[PDB]
Amino acid sequence: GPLGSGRPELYTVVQHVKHFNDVVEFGENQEFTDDIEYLLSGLKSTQPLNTRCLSVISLATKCAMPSFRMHLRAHGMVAMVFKTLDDSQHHQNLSLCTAALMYILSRDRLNMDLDRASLDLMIRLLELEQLNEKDMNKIKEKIRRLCETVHNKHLDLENITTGHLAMETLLSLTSKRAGDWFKEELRLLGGLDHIVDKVKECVDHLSRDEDEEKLVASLWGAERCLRVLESVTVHNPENQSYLIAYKDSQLIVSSAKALQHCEELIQQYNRAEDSICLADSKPLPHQNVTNHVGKAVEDCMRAIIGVLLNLTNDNEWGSTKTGEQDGLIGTALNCVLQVPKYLPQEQRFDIRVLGLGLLINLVEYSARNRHCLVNMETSCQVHAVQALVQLFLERERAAQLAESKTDELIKDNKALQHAGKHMEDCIVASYTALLLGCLCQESPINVTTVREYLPEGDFSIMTEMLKKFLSFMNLTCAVGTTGQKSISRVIEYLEHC
């Protein structure tokens, strides 16, 4: 039962005490009961705003002390502290302080301490959108140092904002460390409804034409929220299901549109270093504007696909509903074949894997997604399978050469990079082979096609690659038995082609 404990639970408790980190006192240090009633009064609406902000920071500063937090929570003051701050959303300065306070507090498990109201507050602070500067920076710097100390989290001062700290709070509340309590509560009490609605607002603003500031705010507004939605769906089928159902699949509908806008926007803000943009209208690759918007577009993309992966991984209504969105399957394919050439070299690996992974999810069981993909057409115009075989072969060479360059250096650390690029080109070739193999085993017709565009019609170039890939996967330990087994089966199948 709930009172019962296994060895792991007790081992943690005992290890937590013996080798410290938490140097705590259970004793009613009444100095706390003093400090605390003095601070609580500084938080009230009846107080000038700057006095409140400083009272919050001072309270957050004391909360870097595990013993203080413990006494704050043991007296049941947390819900009360945040009730007093429940008007924070109406003031941007106090909103930053309030978000910072709960982030620090969320180092611990707040199952018993946060109430619905305080949870709704933090969601409001996450939805928030936008004179006393030189000591707001001193406050921001103070917050940054607290974040490092309490969470081992290093943030740039440019990221000590309300949107960031509210996001980090919601990620911290729904991490592995936190458990599942708040993943559950965010759903059951309407929290996820509001985060999705916010994603829709932001994504609808990309569809219009807007200036740098408004564009970055739209994108960052979506990402911020998408990352919380990604978090709450990790190992949580309920939340995946809820987000697929909510408002006629609003999240997926908005996500698909967003991904498409992003595909277009990213061309507009090229940061590729091996590129030469013709247009004088397009920002140069080294401008502040370009690395500010372009990075914002990329980050939003990674967030969109992350959510879509979680919704389509095991859930087939998710895959069905996601595949039905006009142009998504096409956009996903473009994320692999086209988008990367408008990104810094370092970022191309991640996007290719994500796009390929999403395609695999969509195509695994959905016949109609399968059909839509094989009949798709793309650039280098050609059919999808043909393009995917090309990507494989292209990347399979890029790899065996990138290893030659680094096999030369070891004898005759530019090799490190060349080795890193070797691995990357292999994994991309691998996922491409895995996708093609998937399409093949679901229909022999596709086998004929891949054979046509395969040198000699010899599938061994794919199967040999997948064997090494499966072996590499078990080095990462990222995939479990079923995953490993089904990859093996794909190798078997292709081996008989």
Curated annotation (Swiss-Prot):
**Which cellular compartments is it found in?**
Nucleus; Chromosome; Cytoplasm
How is this protein organized at the quaternary level?
Interacts with the cohesin complex throughout the cell cycle; interacts with both chromatin-bound and soluble pools of the complex. Interacts with RAD21; the interaction is direct. Interacts with PDS5A; the interaction is direct, cohesin-dependent and competitive with CDCA5/SORORIN. Interacts (via FGF motifs) with PDS5B; the interaction is direct. Interacts with a SMC1 protein (SMC1A or SMC1B) and SMC3.
Homology family:
Belongs to the WAPL family.
Q: Mutating M423A: effect?
A: Impaired sister chromatid cohesion and resolution
Q: Which domain of life is it from?
A: Eukaryota
Range within the parent protein: 631 to 1190 of 1190
Its recorded name reads Wings apart-like protein homolog
PTM per UniProt? Deubiquitinated by USP37; leading to stabilization.
Q: Which tissues does the record link to its expression?
A: Isoform 1 is highly expressed in uterine cervix tumor. Isoform 2 is widely expressed with a high level in skeletal muscle and heart.
The coiled-coil segments of this chain are 127-153
Signal peptide extent:
none
Where is the WAPL domain positioned along the sequence? 9-476
Q: What does this protein do?
A: Regulator of sister chromatid cohesion in mitosis which negatively regulates cohesin association with chromatin. Involved in both sister chromatid cohesion during interphase and sister-chromatid resolution during early stages of mitosis. Couples DNA replication to sister chromatid cohesion. Cohesion ensures that chromosome partitioning is accurate in both meiotic and mitotic cells and plays an important role in DNA repair.
Ranked from the top, the taxonomy reads:
Eukaryota, Metazoa, Chordata, Craniata, Vertebrata
Q: What is the effect of changing R109H?
A: Found in a patient with cohesinopathy; uncertain significance
UniProt modified residues of type Phosphoserine: S275
